[PDB]
Amino acid sequence: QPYWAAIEADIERYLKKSITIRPPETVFGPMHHLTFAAPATAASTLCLAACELVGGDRSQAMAAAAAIHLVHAAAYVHEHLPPAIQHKYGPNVELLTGDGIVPFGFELLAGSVDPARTDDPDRILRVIIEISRAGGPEGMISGLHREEEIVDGNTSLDFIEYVCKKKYGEMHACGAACGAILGGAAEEEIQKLRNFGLYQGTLRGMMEMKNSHQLIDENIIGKLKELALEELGGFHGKNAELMSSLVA
Amino acid sequence: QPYWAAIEADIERYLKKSITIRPPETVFGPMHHLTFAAPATAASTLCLAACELVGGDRSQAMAAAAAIHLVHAAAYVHEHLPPAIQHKYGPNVELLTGDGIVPFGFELLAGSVDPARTDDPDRILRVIIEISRAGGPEGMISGLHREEEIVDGNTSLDFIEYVCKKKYGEMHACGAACGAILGGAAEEEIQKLRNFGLYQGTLRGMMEMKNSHQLIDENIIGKLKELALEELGGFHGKNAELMSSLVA
Amino acid sequence: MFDFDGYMLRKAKSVNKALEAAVQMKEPLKIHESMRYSLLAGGKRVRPMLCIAACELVGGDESTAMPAACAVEMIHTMSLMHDDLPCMDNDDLRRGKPTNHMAFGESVAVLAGDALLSFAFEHVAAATKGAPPERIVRVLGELAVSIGSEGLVAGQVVDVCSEGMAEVGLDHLEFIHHHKTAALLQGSVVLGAILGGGKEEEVAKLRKFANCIGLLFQVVDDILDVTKSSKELGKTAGKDLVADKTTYPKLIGVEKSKEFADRLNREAQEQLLHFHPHRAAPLIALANYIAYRDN
Amino acid sequence: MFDFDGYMLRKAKSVNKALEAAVQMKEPLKIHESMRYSLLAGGKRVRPMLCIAACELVGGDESTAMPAACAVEMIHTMSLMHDDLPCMDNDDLRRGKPTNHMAFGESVAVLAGDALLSFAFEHVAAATKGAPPERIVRVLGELAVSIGSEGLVAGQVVDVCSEGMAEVGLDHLEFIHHHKTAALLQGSVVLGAILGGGKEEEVAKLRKFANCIGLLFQVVDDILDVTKKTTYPKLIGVEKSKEFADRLNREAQEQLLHFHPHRAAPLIALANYIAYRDN
Ligand SMILES: C=C(C)CCOP(=O)(O)OP(=O)(O)O
Ligand SMILES: CC(C)=CCSP(=O)(O)OP(=O)(O)O
Ligand SMILES: [Mg+2]
Numbered sequence A, B: 001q002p003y004w005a006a007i008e009a010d011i012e013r014y015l016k017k018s019i020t021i022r023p024p025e026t027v028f029g030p031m032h033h034l035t036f037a038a039p040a041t042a043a044s045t046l047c048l049a050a051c052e053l054v055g056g057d058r059s060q061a062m063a064a065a066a067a068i069h070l071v072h073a074a075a076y077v078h079e080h081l082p083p084a085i086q087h088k089y090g091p092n093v094e095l096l097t098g099d100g101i102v103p104f105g106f107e108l109l110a111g112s113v114d115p116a117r118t119d120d121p122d123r124i125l126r127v128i129i130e131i132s133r134a135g136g137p138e139g140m141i142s143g144l145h146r147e148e149e150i151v152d153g154n155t156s157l158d159f160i161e162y163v164c165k166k167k168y169g170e171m172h173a174c175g176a177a178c179g180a181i182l183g184g185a186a187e188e189e190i191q192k193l194r195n196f197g198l199y200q201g202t203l204r205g206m207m208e209m210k211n212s213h214q215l216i217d218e219n220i221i222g223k224l225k226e227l228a229l230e231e232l233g234g235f236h237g238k239n240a241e242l243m244s245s246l247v248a
Numbered sequence C: 001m002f003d004f005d006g007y008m009l010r011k012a013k014s015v016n017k018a019l020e021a022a023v024q025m026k027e028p029l030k031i032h033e034s035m036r037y038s039l040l041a042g043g044k045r046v047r048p049m050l051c052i053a054a055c056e057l058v059g060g061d062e063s064t065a066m067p068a069a070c071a072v073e074m075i076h077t078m079s080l081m082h083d084d085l086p087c088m089d090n091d092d093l094r095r096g097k098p099t100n101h102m103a104f105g106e107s108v109a110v111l112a113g114d115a116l117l118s119f120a121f122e123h124v125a126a127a128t129k130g131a132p133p134e135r136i137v138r139v140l141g142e143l144a145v146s147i148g149s150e151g152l153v154a155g156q157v158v159d160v161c162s163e164g165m166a167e168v169g170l171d172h173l174e175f176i177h178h179h180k181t182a183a184l185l186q187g188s189v190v191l192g193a194i195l196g197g198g199k200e201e202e203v204a205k206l207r208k209f210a211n212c213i214g215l216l217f218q219v220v221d222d223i224l225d226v227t228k229s230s231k232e233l234g235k236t237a238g239k240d241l242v243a244d245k246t247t248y249p250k251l252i253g254v255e256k257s258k259e260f261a262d263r264l265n266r267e268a269q270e271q272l273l274h275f276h277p278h279r280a281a282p283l284i285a286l287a288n289y290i291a292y293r294d295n
Numbered sequence D: 001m002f003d004f005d006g007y008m009l010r011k012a013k014s015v016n017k018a019l020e021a022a023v024q025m026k027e028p029l030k031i032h033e034s035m036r037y038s039l040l041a042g043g044k045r046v047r048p049m050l051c052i053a054a055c056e057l058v059g060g061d062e063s064t065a066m067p068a069a070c071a072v073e074m075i076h077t078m079s080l081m082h083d084d085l086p087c088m089d090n091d092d093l094r095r096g097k098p099t100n101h102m103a104f105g106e107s108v109a110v111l112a113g114d115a116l117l118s119f120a121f122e123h124v125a126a127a128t129k130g131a132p133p134e135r136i137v138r139v140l141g142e143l144a145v146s147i148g149s150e151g152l153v154a155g156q157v158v159d160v161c162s163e164g165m166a167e168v169g170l171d172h173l174e175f176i177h178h179h180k181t182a183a184l185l186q187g188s189v190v191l192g193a194i195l196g197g198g199k200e201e202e203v204a205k206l207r208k209f210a211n212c213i214g215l216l217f218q219v220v221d222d223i224l225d226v227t228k229k230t231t232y233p234k235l236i237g238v239e240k241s242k243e244f245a246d247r248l249n250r251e252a253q254e255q256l257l258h259f260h261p262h263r264a265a266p267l268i269a270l271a272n273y274i275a276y277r278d279n
């Protein structure tokens, strides 16, 4: 656990020295509170792990991991208006703050281009494309949208699994993929991590939905774990046996 | 347009020598009737025109053009499956015949391998892949399916135009691309005619949807013609003037 | 000793693993959902196993035959989806659950079915590995022929055109049995025999063999219908009585029909005396299961 | 003599043709249809024009700025989509038709607008050609800063949190106008100036120009309403506000003197139009 917890904390610290509450407090108060009230996401974590699994420096993926957390954060806020529970801020301030969170993710990335590293520009452009895609209409939004069609004890597992593949999967694959890219890995190893990511997040999403749909056949969590690990073969490093953690 | 009519007739004659009514009449009668009571499709002609426009001979894509027509005939028969009017055949026989037309199409292709032409096996395999896909769940069927969601004077032109891209487009793109393949064109050429076909077929589909939902902004016919030609440039030949006619 | 049970257990599992992998959920979600609803609902998977067994018999191995094994099962599944429709048998139960058109409506049922037919060819043509192109095209052609106007479909059409009269010809009936069920069993056996590299005479002998267990298959199915309940069969049963539809038990009772079954199974196994008894064991076990299955 | 009308028509037609191409129908059909419903509804297309014009002003050409011009239009669309929602202005109509949530449901409108925002970055980053990677990255970063917490959004949030107090100060009002309207005009002009290879001091001059017409627009709107809730006329009177208008206009055009008067014609025509508009 120390490894994963210390990755999450590095990401929190970084977001914290980046998102500083200040006048106009009416704007950064909500930007700060909504960003840290959103559950953390394994897609950010997976970003740093993959980066390190392929040889690169955690610091090479921090902005990407931060950015993925923010994109996830905004979608979460937008998901949870209507007033289901208790909000610190009104529906309008939250809608508008989600709209400000995603852009800040891209700002962080663009501002991280070290100009003494000949290779930054290209890798970062690529990552911006991957993160904007995973978060757009063909990825996550595709999933937030089909979610609407679910009916507690009526809709099938097959359907639920696909909502999980779009809502969470696409974002985990983007995370592992981006870590690979920031780390300088080869196309072959990016593809593998991307796939690994996809399953892991699909599975992670099936759990967030275990708590409602109790129909979840133990065989589905099994086919995913298995598809995940099949993916990590050919690859090695402790993260090659530590990556196989959230499939146990 | 003399040239097209001849292409039309050559396709018809081949079909005719291929689909012979033989005992059991109860099975081949309907197979023969439905196959020719189906409106002819420019997807089939496009196939030969594209083969000739790239350098091969018409005979090089007769089987594909024929298989293309059959795939569209079955979808047509399956599109009209209630007792809406007294059709010449009952609903079960028509549904079954449709199921028998599709495979016959793959039988023609298969049996059309000339072991004298070293490169046939591969060209034909790829044509079977392209044809089974355009006809599959992600092509024409996507179209037949969403067509159901239309409420004439309530659904947008954007929705109508996408059902037209899936229901007619995909098959036309397939025809054009299968002719390029059979005529040994190069990958750049194929993609171009493929795209040419998608626009052409969408626009054509807009003509058969004009006969009811007539609030078609004449600029939707406009952009399609225009996108079709912007596609044909870079190509030269008689058919390059003739294909161009198919749209302007 | 040959442990048939364990064997079918192992092949079934492999085929179900490949099937689920081949047909994934993707947009349009309903077409794909309805395809997976019927395809992974799980049946005996006799055809996929006939295909793999035939490939392994002539020396080939399972993974070159798997996409073809999947393809015949998809074609099989689409013929049930179409068969169950209101304009056909109008049945409400299949494979333990509501028929497709009851779960998704008529249209998605027709379409989901045609998509399977299409994907069967795309799947064999793009995923088969370990075989040369001329071979894969030959196989696709045999698949075509077995399922269309000279095959499955011909048997189906003639069958619905025979429910018109109570006046049942003795061999307007064999024509229906050889095309309705035997044709696709032969197709399964041949795709795998050819894929495994079987020589022509081996292919021809397997073809003749599939024709016997194929005629057998339909005979046993006609028996179970009038001797089993819907819950047991997983489908609406006994409707052969409430439909002027000629079956063997109707034409010669159940005892002469069972008698005819063993005669068919014995002839089946006689045909495999062609191969070494060791190579033959899976097919023989499969001939017996097709003959004594309780569902 | 520069025909501004025709000019505006040519650019709009170019932009609409590219937006149409960049945002197509595909599953999920409703998210995409909602995006098109609002994005291709047609408009003056002032922001994509400013982007393109700024790029041709410094010597670059249209095709290079097009994806960024498309991007700023998408962000402007998403801002309107959100503003029309029930938890905001709660409007029933916009730009000639039912609002997006009325036509597709609140949930689809929120998501479609989110889809627009992120696709803006995907599109500028993957489709821009004729520019080096660090240049494209600098631009994505500029787009970011202009739409977020120190831009468009901060303007909207401070505005919404001001609807409570019937009484308001002048520099609170100017803060809303600069972030609400000007920030995206500046971003538009800068993505283009930077994509066309503009030198840093040409960029700076275009930024000033963008802030002035931006501010100018609001100040004129406030004047029209009155000479036909806190506003300029109430804080400093109409005479002084009109004065202020002319001063902003004057400062905008001063920024453009650095450039070929021929390339600047549209931007000068535009500043003068925002300033003397009958409505
Ligand atoms: C008797 C015929 C012609 C078809 C039913 O086949 P099956 O009985 O093989 O059924 P499944 O196991 O696939 O469900
Ligand atoms: C052979 C084909 C295509 C379908 C099965 S014919 P059938 O209706 O006798 O079989 P079922 O009882 O419905 O299983
Ligand atoms: Mg039947």
Ligand SMILES: [Mg+2]
Binding pocket: C083, C084, C089, C091
């Ligand atoms: Mg039946």
